[model samples]
Target: KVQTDPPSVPICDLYPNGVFPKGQECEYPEEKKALDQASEEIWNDFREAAEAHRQVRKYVMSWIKPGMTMIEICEKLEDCSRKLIKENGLNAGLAFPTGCSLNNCAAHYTPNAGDTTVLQYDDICKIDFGTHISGRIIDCAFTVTFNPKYDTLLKAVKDATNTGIKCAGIDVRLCDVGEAIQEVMESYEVEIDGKTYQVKPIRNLNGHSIGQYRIHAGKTVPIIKGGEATRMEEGEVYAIETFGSTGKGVVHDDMECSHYMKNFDVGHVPIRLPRTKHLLNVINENFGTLAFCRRWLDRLGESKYLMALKNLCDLGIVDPYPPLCDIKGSYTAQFEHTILLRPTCKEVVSRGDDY
Candidate 1:
């Protein structure tokens, strides 16, 4: 049983054409049934969130240029997010995300407080964000590098995502998306700068069922297995994400989230110093098993809520990806589609624009 009683919402009801295996059956994310029951309400929220996200995306795209730094981008993105949220009564799900790249060192990045890095004519700017409405999250990944070499990768990943979409609508297995993605990577490696780098897809960052609370919850609609094997059913929701590299099959590394600090309160009602009490309570009420930014937690004067959070995770009340195990990486391409599996087919709500 999903955390929700009747299931939050059915992805198929929301976006009918987003799931594959057109007429198959599989348990969607835990909230599926609830969402179905509240289809009208959920759809209303979906439209609003999509529009807010579209606004932020447009702003972010415009903010990127040849001379801007990832730091600047980060600052601007946060501004856009906060502004959009405030103005539209919505929230940004991704926590302060920014993009960057340096020769062989590329993704899973964000900016530091005092870091001073500048973008160049041929450099790449990777961007990712998550937009939320009523705690329903729709995450997105984008790259708008200046160089043609990296520019083409944007198109490649776009195509891969599109192929997966097509397959989804046509009733193929979820794994078919992997085969299609790999085929695109192998047969049509995008050329960036002067390198004809074949995509070394992670094959691991498979899509997951999403909604309400973030990171990962409910269920997963996996990819990277094989067609007809791990295929999906209608009335499901899967975030179809693909990782492509311009170099080797492996990446340089993944970065551990930089937010953890040790001075956190260790109890059920952890409080951050003199200021975070209000924010902590609000977040918990909304996000359920919310995780605090580690850096902020260290600066707290209390351990009550922090302890409970840690215990929740430790005791399985919450599951931290155990960020300490995160790695760093290289140039990669990613695109996400929050698909809705239904009787007619899968509907992609995150597409934002009518494609």
Candidate 2:
């Protein structure tokens, strides 16, 4: 159960007292309106966004199974999502590439062209994806478990996510959400291969606030409490996530780089190489502010532009995100949901029974 303790005294002063009216400016410029106070037009927009996520998530959960290739999984997910968009006429699109992080990989792992990794019966798979209507987005994730030994690990992550969601409401402090998630995770203990293991919430990864075309807005719901404390304001959207592990909770950066995002507007930046400049132009026009994968570049016949991509990263013109990996010989699970904070309730747009 989530603790309903009154927020710390300082948090009250830092954040608004009650729900801010929908579409109106709060004292914080980044804050938006709560779901309950949003206009009918905005509410309807999110409704479509919610429905889009539900369908795609359900499809992914059921369609993916053992023996599937990683590339096949990514292509199937995209096909399912596009079919849904066209059939429902929803004004939405993929927020990011279909990420399939296997085994100890925590996040940001996706398939590249000619990659030949295949799913095994005992592999721990985490699929994270999102959709956006206009600019409103719902980021979601769930771990796909194939073996029964990991039942407790999966449950701990799912329960901790729920704990975070329950603590998520108007005027709740981000620290409170982080603490609650940690507490729930600590309560779950499991025995795998005849050895008792304690579930540890991944410390480095965090749930983030989502904004118009910006997947990570600013604030974070930490899995373990060791970061800056910011109050979660009403009318703001957040993706509350938790990662539970059977080994050390820390994740290390892997050499498998699959994701990249433009850091800022590069219009006036000095570019010495013409190919690098052309690559930057292509990125800005195709992806805008969203993070994209190298496979996206490969499909554009830009495979020969690796030097330019490296130059962009070297010059700090773009940010390359490497895959996060858990300790060797360990398994992990993850759960997440994009939520809208109301005056007294939270609307979990990606809620599903299987999750």
Candidate 3:
């Protein structure tokens, strides 16, 4: 069993007597106040969500089997997250839709309501999910396979994610971090059947800085080298994720759309249909900018919403995310962790005994 209690804070370690040094002035008062805010309730909420992720993932890793359907696994994991995190409408809940991408599918492949894909013993599955407390999201993921042939592929991605996390620091260049991750990821090769395949980091997909109620908050942490030179800043939260594949390390949109979030960039799009307007209201009230799936809409007592949802998408009011997949017959693996560049130190908030 995983510990449900919040992880200990690093900032609290400085105050041995439960108080700051009396009358000690800081160089930057505003920066000190921001750091204090992070160490206080915000840090607690982050740890809370991290612990919830650890607990739910513990159940998932042990209980998931080869015969389970994709929808079954997604629903079970999501339900477990809700129960563990004590999800509310928007205050605290899933940060995004639970992604259960299998094999060549790299990311964003959560099952829709009627999806019947079954997990095979030979299939490599990447389960990515997130939990949030007051919008401080903990986005983490891991890969699983019943067969041991693809173990090296999984290790490459896991090590790459850890390398990215270790290289990340306040003011560290994002491109440098990506270079380190790519170096570690591409060094390993996986042997399957009678052939050997060198692991390649997915070029297009990237880790991203997360904002309150926003998953992809502007800056992106690339998995490969030669990306933008944006620097990691203090008091920032990031998902240092990596994806390794045996195919051409590029992904394209495929399959049916199940993931969606509000289009905050689009402005004042007129809605002619009342159903579309009502759907927009539901999205605003429940999801805000966080991503949600059709299964969630069903849970909200919404029936026959596909047409309305399509209209909303067409109106540029809602953005749809389809499954991202590489070339068929290739296997992919991913590992991720959410890190906080705290004032005192970098804390891998989502770190657990299990990766």
lDDT of each: 0.51, 0.75, 0.84
As for TM-score, the candidate ahead, 1 or 2, is: 2
lDDT of 2 at 306: 78
Q: What tens-digit string does per-residue lDDT give for candidate 2 at 80-155?
A: 6655443222245667777789888889999877788999989999999776666677688899878898898998
Q: Count clashes in each candidate, considering only residues at least 3 apart in sequence or on different chains.
A: 49, 2, 0
| TM-score list, all predictions | 0.67, 0.85, 0.90
C-alpha RMSD of each candidate structure in angstroms: 9.6, 10.0, 5.8
Candidate 3 Cα misplacement greater than 4 A, ranges: 1-39, 267-272
Better of 1 and 3 by lDDT: 3
| Per-residue alpha-carbon lDDT of candidate 3 for residues 1-355, written as tens digits (9 for 90 to 100) | 3233332222223233434221111221177657656566777777778877877888888789999999899888887788767778898889998888999999999888878899999999888999998899989999989999998888889999988888888888999998999999989988998799989999999999998888888999988889988888987889999999988999999999899998767666666678888888888889998999999899899988899999888877889999999999999999999887777667787888898
Name the candidate that leads on lDDT. Answer: 3
Candidates sorted on TM-score, descending: 3, 2, 1
Say what the RMSD of model 2 is: 10.0
Give the CA lDDT, 0 to 100, for residue 27 in model 3: 26
